[PDB]
Amino acid sequence: ITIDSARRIFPNTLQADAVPALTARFNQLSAEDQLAWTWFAFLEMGKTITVAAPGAASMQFAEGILKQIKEMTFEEQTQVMCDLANHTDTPICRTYATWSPNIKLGFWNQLGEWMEQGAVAPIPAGYQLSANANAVLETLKSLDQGQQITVLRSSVVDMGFDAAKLDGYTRVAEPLVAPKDISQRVQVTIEGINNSTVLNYMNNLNANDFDELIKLFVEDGALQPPFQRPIVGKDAILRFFREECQNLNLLPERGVAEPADDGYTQVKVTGKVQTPWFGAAVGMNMAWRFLLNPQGKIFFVAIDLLASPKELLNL
Numbered sequence: 001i002t003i004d005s006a007r008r009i010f011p012n013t014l015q016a017d018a019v020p021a022l023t024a025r026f027n028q029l030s031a032e033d034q035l036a037w038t039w040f041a042f043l044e045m046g047k048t049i050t051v052a053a054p055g056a057a058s059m060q061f062a063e064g065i066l067k068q069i070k071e072m073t074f075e076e077q078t079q080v081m082c083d084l085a086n087h088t089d090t091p092i093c094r095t096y097a098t099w100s101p102n103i104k105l106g107f108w109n110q111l112g113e114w115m116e117q118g119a120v121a122p123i124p125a126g127y128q129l130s131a132n133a134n135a136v137l138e139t140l141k142s143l144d145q146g147q148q149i150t151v152l153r154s155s156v157v158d159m160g161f162d163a164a165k166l167d168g169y170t171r172v173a174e175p176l177v178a179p180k181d182i183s184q185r186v187q188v189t190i191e192g193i194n195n196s197t198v199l200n201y202m203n204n205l206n207a208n209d210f211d212e213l214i215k216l217f218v219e220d221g222a223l224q225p226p227f228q229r230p231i232v233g234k235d236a237i238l239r240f241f242r243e244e245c246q247n248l249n250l251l252p253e254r255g256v257a258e259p260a261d262d263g264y265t266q267v268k269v270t271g272k273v274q275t276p277w278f279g280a281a282v283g284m285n286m287a288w289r290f291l292l293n294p295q296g297k298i299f300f301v302a303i304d305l306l307a308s309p310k311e312l313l314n315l
């Protein structure tokens with residue numbers, strides 16, 4: 001048993017790889033097309049769902065850069081936005097790179113508001129997307145909403161300076177919320193599954209109880225978010241929880257458990273997940289794939305975004 005082999009459990013699980021597919025196509029576009037594209041994608045999104053107001057604690061980390069941009073001319077603002085899209089080496093792009101996804105999202109949500117308000121340079125009124133950009137946008141509109149918001153988030157996260165090239169830095173993230181009181185936790189129920197570790201995983205995460213959640217993992221275990229590489233080691237996993245996994249609502253529905261190598265157990269769970277950005281307005285179709293050692297500790301868990309609601313019944 002290795003992490004590489006663990007990634008392969010439950011191979012008939014059909015992930016929504018249309019997301020990385022579309023991201024690849026989007027990445028072929030010019031910075032100018034990218035900004036215009038996302039503006040139109042953002043407006044399209046607004047036809048059905050509204051972004052929740054970012055937390056004040058989150059925005060205080062973006063406030064400095066936002067203030068600087070707001071005081072710029074339209075031409076200067078557009079250049080900064082192009083710099084972010086191009087991953088150009090600039091002070092703003094380097095600052096951006098140290099931010100967690102939620103801070104990056106709150107930052108762009110504010111710029112979007114200011115674009116609507118006339119405070120930040122808008123997309124040119126009669127701007128024409130390239131043929132390829134148009135086609136990418138058409139494909140976006142054809143995907144379910146869970147896949148749509150995942151594409152937009154991924155693109156936001158990938159802007160700015162290459163974080164890897166910053167070497168060591170203080171990571172900027174939202175402050176920790178106190179875990180929910182036990183009496184206030186709404187425990188999950190999973191049809192076909194009684195596994196204590198899986199239930200503890202779901203309930204602790206829903207409670208923002210990361211200190212108890214991390215105890216479920218083995219030292220050298222790993223967690224794999226949708227479409228990215230596994231995050232290895234309890235230290236990295238806990239940091240991921242604290243920085244990116246606050247105020248989620250996991251609503252698992254069904255699951256199955258099977259024997260695995262070396263006395264391990266593998267467990268597949270399907271259900272829905274809500275992000276605090278949209279709440280109940282977007283229930284993403286998810287699968288969890290656990291690999292548990294004989295002591296019931298988590299060696300590996302993959303979290304998949306599924307290709308369609310039909311996959312929820314694929315056990």
Ligand SMILES: CC1=C(/C=C/C(C)=C/C=C/C(C)=C/C=C/C=C(C)/C=C/C=C(C)/C=C/C2=C(C)C(=O)CCC2(C)C)C(C)(C)CCC1=O
Pocket residue numbers: 034035036038039042051105108109110111112113115149150152153156205224225226244245248250273275277284286303
């Ligand atoms: C950029 C841009 C703009 C702005 C655009 C804007 C403002 C875009 C913003 C878009 C927003 C707010 C997107 C939010 C996405 C959140 C998702 C997909 C969360 C998923 C979480 C999941 C599945 C959780 C999963 C989890 C579970 C279940 C676990 O079990 C373990 C934890 C884990 C995390 C893995 C403008 C409009 C100004 C145009 C110019 C321009 O470029």
